[PDB]
Amino acid sequence: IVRPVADFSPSLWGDQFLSFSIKNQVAEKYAKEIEALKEQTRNMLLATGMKLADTLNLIDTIERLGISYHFEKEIDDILDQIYNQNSNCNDLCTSALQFRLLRQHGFNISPEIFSKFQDENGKFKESLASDVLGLLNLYEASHVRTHADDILEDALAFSTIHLESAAPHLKSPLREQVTHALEQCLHKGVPRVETRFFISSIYDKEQSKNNVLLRFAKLDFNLLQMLHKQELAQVSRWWKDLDFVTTLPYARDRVVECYFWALGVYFEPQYSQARVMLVKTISMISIVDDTFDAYGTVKELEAYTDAIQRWDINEIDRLPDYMKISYKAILDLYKDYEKELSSAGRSHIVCHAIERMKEVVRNYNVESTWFIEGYTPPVSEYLSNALATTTYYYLATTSYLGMKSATEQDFEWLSKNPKILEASVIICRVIDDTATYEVEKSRGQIATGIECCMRDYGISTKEAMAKFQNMAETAWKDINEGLLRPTPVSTEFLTPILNLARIVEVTYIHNLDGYTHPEKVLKPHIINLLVDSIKI
Numbered sequence: 001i002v003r004p005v006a007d008f009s010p011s012l013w014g015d016q017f018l019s020f021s022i023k024n025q026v027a028e029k030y031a032k033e034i035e036a037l038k039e040q041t042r043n044m045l046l047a048t049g050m051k052l053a054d055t056l057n058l059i060d061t062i063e064r065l066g067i068s069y070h071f072e073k074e075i076d077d078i079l080d081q082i083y084n085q086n087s088n089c090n091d092l093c094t095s096a097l098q099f100r101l102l103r104q105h106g107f108n109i110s111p112e113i114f115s116k117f118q119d120e121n122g123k124f125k126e127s128l129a130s131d132v133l134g135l136l137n138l139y140e141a142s143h144v145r146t147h148a149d150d151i152l153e154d155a156l157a158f159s160t161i162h163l164e165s166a167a168p169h170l171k172s173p174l175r176e177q178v179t180h181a182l183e184q185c186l187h188k189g190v191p192r193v194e195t196r197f198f199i200s201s202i203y204d205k206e207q208s209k210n211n212v213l214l215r216f217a218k219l220d221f222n223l224l225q226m227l228h229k230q231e232l233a234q235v236s237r238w239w240k241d242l243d244f245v246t247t248l249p250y251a252r253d254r255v256v257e258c259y260f261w262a263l264g265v266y267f268e269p270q271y272s273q274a275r276v277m278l279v280k281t282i283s284m285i286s287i288v289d290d291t292f293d294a295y296g297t298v299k300e301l302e303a304y305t306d307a308i309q310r311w312d313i314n315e316i317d318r319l320p321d322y323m324k325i326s327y328k329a330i331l332d333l334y335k336d337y338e339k340e341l342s343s344a345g346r347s348h349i350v351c352h353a354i355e356r357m358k359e360v361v362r363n364y365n366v367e368s369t370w371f372i373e374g375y376t377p378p379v380s381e382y383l384s385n386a387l388a389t390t391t392y393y394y395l396a397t398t399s400y401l402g403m404k405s406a407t408e409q410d411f412e413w414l415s416k417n418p419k420i421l422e423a424s425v426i427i428c429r430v431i432d433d434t435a436t437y438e439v440e441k442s443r444g445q446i447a448t449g450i451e452c453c454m455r456d457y458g459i460s461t462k463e464a465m466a467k468f469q470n471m472a473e474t475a476w477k478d479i480n481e482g483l484l485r486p487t488p489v490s491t492e493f494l495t496p497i498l499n500l501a502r503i504v505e506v507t508y509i510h511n512l513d514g515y516t517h518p519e520k521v522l523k524p525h526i527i528n529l530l531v532d533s534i535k536i
């Protein structure tokens with residue numbers, strides 16, 4: 001008796017990532033020049049007597065070039081002084097850039113800086129329609145607004161229509177920059193993805209470009225990439241020596257895509273241990289999801305759920321043979337995590353990710369019960385269960401394990417479901433439900449998010465999808481507020497949550513599943529970050 005037929009596609013990568021040997025003489029040549037270039041760039045930033053506009057473009061450029069992680073103190077000192085001087089007598093270009101940079105760094109600059117660009121209605125003067133650089137910087141700023149910033153309600157609609165109108169007659173590479181911004185704003189994009197584009201497609205082709213910065217950025221990207229390929233190789237060998245590819249054939253083989261996810265949360269060198277731990281957890285929870293979703297009967301899913309709650313190797317024999325495989329690999333993974341952290345006396349913190357995982361599994365089992373019964377809950381009740389099945393409470397907790405500065409007090413903050421984490425989870429939930437509604441409705445999912453929304457409020461599929469779209473917009477306003485100073489925990493521990501929200505937006509862009517169907521969205525990203533170097 002049982003089970004379903006297989007419909008998931010295999011790893012489109014094969015074994016091309018399994019073996020990477022660093023050219024050690026090259027790695028050392030790149031690092032040699034980067035040291036030199038890094039200090040020239042420090043002295044650019046610490047130059048006395050620059051104009052406001054010149055300082056902001058410098059800082060903007062270093063950030064989009066992806067080398068700003070080298071200068072976090074310098075950039076901060078400078079923005080703090082800009083914030084505290086209240087300078088605005090400027091143009092739309094400089095004002096909007098000033099607003100965006102300060103807010104992204106948590107400085108609660110007043111949105112009244114924009115009042116001089118508006119009439120008596122809080123609607124932007126149409127005489128600004130001929131100023132393309134002003135419109136571009138306004139467009140990017142409009143994505144960083146909060147609930148206190150309703151003066152900016154018109155800014156996205158206003159800049160968009162006039163950038164669309166101007167774009168075809170613009171010189172290059174400006175035209176390519178405007179066209180790309182309309183597809184993907186800076187604030188909600190994945191940082192490595194935006195950096196690759198900017199270095200190669202834009203800055204490399206500017207006539208105004210600074211040669212020192214460009215070469216710095218190219219060498220730095222390509223050097224980090226060698227690190228990332230080493231990480232991916234070692235994770236690929238771990239996945240292979242597990243061999244779920246042949247013994248648990250019902251599950252997707254997506255370890256490379258899971259690594260891309262992890263790289264989106266943080267790309268810097270100091271988080272290499274954190275990235276390796278995170279990707280192992282993503283790929284394992286993905287197998288557990290396919291067990292609930294694509295193979296296991298209601299009886300054995302109940303046994304799997306209770307074994308996860310009790311968390312004890314003694315429990316394996318109460319499970320079907322095929323569940324013994326994954327269950328043992330899960331218990332083993334956390335015993336590994338404990339050993340790796342034993343060297344800095346941080347083993348005790350592992351228990352936090354584990355409790356979050358038990359929670360994910362309970363809700364997988366509820367979601368299954370709803371399916372068998374054909375139950376369509378209220379939107380209220382649907383959310384109470386379906387928020388945790390995004391796994392985002394659990395990946396956020398897991399992202400802290402490998403960060404050497406995460407303290408127990410940091411995990412306690414996160415355990416209370418703070419507002420910035422709840423918003424990141426809400427974005428994942430509603431975007432995934434909008435993108436995959438038809439996919440599931442076709443194969444009997446009565447308990448799908450949009451369908452609860454339709455039955456509850458008594459509305460069409462169009463109106464349901466627009467209410468979800470709107471929940472996502474509210475959630476971004478709450479993320480943006482959550483970054484403002486004074487912060488509840490250090491900023492280092494907020495950025496991973498923000499980056500989780502960015503991954504959703506990039507993966508589900510234009511509205512179909514990019515994780516299940518990687519060749520859609522992710523394949524070109526993975527090639528640009530992890531296969532092709534930037535050509536010097």
Ligand SMILES: CC(C)=CCC/C(C)=C/CC/C(C)=C/COP(=O)(O)OP(=O)(O)O
Nearest residue numbers: 261282285286289293389390391428432515
């Ligand atoms: C939610 C999400 C996009 C997570 C991305 C990162 C991650 C943990 C992937 C694991 C596998 C997963 C949740 C696939 C979605 O399919 P599904 O339809 O079984 O997921 P669902 O039950 O959350 O809709």
Ligand SMILES: [Mg+2]
Nearest residue numbers: 289290292293
């Ligand atoms: Mg599922």
Ligand SMILES: [Mg+2]
Nearest residue numbers: 289290293294
């Ligand atoms: Mg699934």
Ligand SMILES: [Mg+2]
Nearest residue numbers: 432433436440
């Ligand atoms: Mg789904």
